[PDB]
Amino acid sequence: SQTIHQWPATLVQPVGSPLSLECTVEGTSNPNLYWYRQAAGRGPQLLFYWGPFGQISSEVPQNLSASRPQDRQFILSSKKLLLSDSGFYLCAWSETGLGMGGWQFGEGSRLTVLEDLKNVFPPEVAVFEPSEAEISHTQKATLVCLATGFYPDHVELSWWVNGKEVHSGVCTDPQPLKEQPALNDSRYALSSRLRVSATFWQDPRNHFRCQVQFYGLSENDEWTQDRAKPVTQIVSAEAWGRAD
Amino acid sequence: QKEVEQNSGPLSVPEGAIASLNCTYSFLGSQSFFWYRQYSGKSPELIMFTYREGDKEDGRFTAQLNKASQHVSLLIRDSQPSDSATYLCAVNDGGRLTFGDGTTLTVKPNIQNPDPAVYQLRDSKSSDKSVCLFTDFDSQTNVSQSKDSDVYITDKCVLDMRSMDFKSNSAVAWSNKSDFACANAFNNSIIPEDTFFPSP
């Protein structure tokens, strides 16, 4: 079969820094390759379209360039990022061979360009134990996890129970909300729920963990503030069941 | 974007109903037509494509194309909560895909045995906040945001893809205020008169 991969998935970089997005496709030869950019609440806009007959480019001036060093590798670059370059970048391909085929996108690249890296904050994470009233009325126990005060707005929250990630009974906000709606550079918050049976919650041997991956600064980014360099990291909170 | 338009407001239907997405394209010589689905935070996924006038049916989805009026539509039958997404129309001309700006669709789950209740959870010692959970209400209930900008409320969440358990609706409200109680957390929302409020 054929697939397509792009990386990095999510980038947080300062203005004036270089950009390099990668994209590879497998299972075909001489594919059409595309780079798109998508704004929130809008459809993907074509940046570059390369193929056997040439390069087609967006009619609107871009601060980006494309390269194809190998048949199945497509790269999106910039020597010097602008604040206006923040966005969601998408790579895609289509079959040039007999018959249709492809028209699939990679996983995308979330790019956040920052004017000032001191605005970056990792999340604080807390888990809240189920209500005894819920347990009585329903025989179910809902735990809640709150990830608060982070910036930029992208984190990945997962729940772990006894060393294994769980998906059943999990409901997580699709996107973070702004703690300060009227303020431009507001920090963010995200919530999730894990619902298990009362009987499972009431065993104190059961260990629950809310885990949040945050993407921020990399090792090479400079930092002189007292607080810990807000680097890409995992922040989590945990709880153990209780008999009561 | 004017070559491909999806001029429609946000759609919403109850689970099991039929939904219909519309799209118009400008070039009559366009060769093929596509529908993608896109969830929050993800890249778009291909649903179907079609190059012939008429209907192309695939499972619960039907792509309809009229090359005279230059309209493309996606018909979704027996809608599922997991069909909740942004739908994108795209048109191929010589290999160049042009996309519309998308249309959102929400499919409300059918809650067979509601039990609207507001509970107070307790922090695991390391926060200072208290959290209130409004859960088990049926989908005809809308959770409004709080007037107090010091109280946060997250209306709807998304059930994990690999979840094998049923889905119930819930809203979370939190604040660090001393006068914050679950008894008033959701006062700006219209909740069922039969909502269970346990008394601590």
Residue numbers in the entry:
A (entry chain E): 1 to 244
B (entry chain D): 1 to 200
Give sentences copied directly from the paper behind this entry:
The T-cell receptor (TCR) recognizes peptides bound to major histocompatibility molecules (MHC) and allows T-cells to interrogate the cellular proteome for internal anomalies from the cell surface. Here we explored these issues using phage display to generate a high affinity TCR derived from the MEL5 TCR specific for the heteroclitic version of the HLA-A*0201-restricted primary melanoma antigen recognized by T-cells 1 (MART-126–35) peptide, ELAGIGILTV (A2-ELA). This TCR, α24β17, bound to A2-ELA with an affinity 30,000 times stronger than the natural parent MEL5 TCR, resulting in picomolar levels of binding. Remarkably, although the enhanced affinity was mediated primarily through new TCR-MHC contacts, α24β17 remained acutely sensitive to modifications at every position along the peptide backbone, mimicking the specificity of the wild type TCR.
Additionally, we solved the structure of the unligated α24β17 TCR and unligated A2-ELA1A, A2-ELA4A, and A2-ELA8A molecules. The structure of the unligated α24β17 TCR demonstrated that a large 8.06 Å conformational shift in CDR3β loop was required to accommodate residues toward the C terminus of the peptide. Together with the observation of a favorable entropy change for binding, these observations indicated that, similar to the MEL5-A2-ELA complex (TΔS° ∼ 8.3 kcal/mol), an entropically favorable transition from order to disorder was key for driving the high affinity interaction, probably through the expulsion of ordered solvent during binding rather than a loss of order at the TCR-pMHC interface.
